[PDB]
Amino acid sequence: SSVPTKLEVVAATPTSLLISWDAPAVTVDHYVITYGETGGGGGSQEFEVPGSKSTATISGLKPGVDYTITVYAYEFYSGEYSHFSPISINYRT
């Protein structure tokens, strides 16, 4: 019951990940892409992607680390920012 519906890593590189997802069938202002070492270690970092795009590329990662990417789809409906149920994946760089 999530938005985006599917989140995958398409391209990988020793220091970077390329991620694609599925255009929700409903209106979306922007996405926030969130990524950090799975296991709390080293604070999470994030960056923002226009609602029209369904592709991002994550940079400056450490090789051979378990990262946990999470994507929030924000709306801006009658006056308010609110995100749908987010989606996460784990990926070993």
Author numbering: 6 to 98
Paper quotes:
Among the most commonly used non-immunoglobulin binders are monobodies (Mb), which are generated from large combinatorial libraries using a fibronectin III domain (FN3; ~10 kDa) of human fibronectin as molecular scaffold. Here, we develop monobodies with nanomolar binding affinities against the d-SH2 domain of the leukemic tyrosine kinase BCR::ABL1. Two crystal structures of heterochiral monobody-SH2 complexes reveal targeting of the pY binding pocket by an unconventional binding mode. In summary, monobody recognition is dominated by the FG loop of both monobodies that form a rippled β-sheet with the βD-strand of the SH2 domain, as well as ionic interactions between glutamate residues of the monobody and arginine residues of the SH2 domain.
We determined the crystal structures of the l-DAM21-d-Abl SH2 and l-DAM27-d-Abl SH2 complexes at 2.7 Å and 2.9 Å resolution, respectively. Of note, to satisfy the large amounts of protein complex needed for crystallization, this batch of the d-Abl SH2 domain was not desulfurized to alanine after NCL and therefore contained a cysteine residue at position 198. In both structures, we found the d-SH2 domain to be dimerized via a disulfide bridge of Cys198. The monobody FG loop, which represents the most extensively diversified region in the library, forms a large part of both interfaces, which have similar buried surface areas (431 Å2 and 440 Å2 in DAM21, 452 Å2 and 427 Å2 in DAM27, for interface 1 and 2, respectively). Interface 2 of both structures largely contains the pY peptide-binding interface (346 Å2 for the pYEEI peptide), whereas interface 1 comprises a region of the SH2 domain surface of unknown functional significance. Unlike those, DAM21/27 form a heterochiral anti-parallel β-sheet between strand Gly84 to Trp88/His88 in DAM21/27 of their FG loop with the βD-strand (Val190 to Arg194) of the d-Abl SH2 domain. The rippled β-sheet position Glu85 in the FG loop is inserted into the SH2 pY pocket, where it forms an ionic interaction with SH2 residue Arg171, which is part of the conserved FLVRES motif and makes the most critical interaction with the phosphate group in pY peptide ligands. An additional ionic interaction was observed in the DAM21/27-SH2 interface: SH2 residue Arg189 interacts with Glu51 in the ßD strand of the monobody and is located at the other end of the heterochiral SH2-monobody interface. Structural superposition of the FG loop conformations of DAM27 and DAM21 revealed a strikingly similar conformation despite their sequence differences in seven out of eleven amino acid positions. In DAM27, Tyr79 packs towards the β-hairpin and His88 is solvent exposed, whereas in DAM21, Trp88 is rotated inwards and would clash with large hydrophobic or aromatic residues at this position.
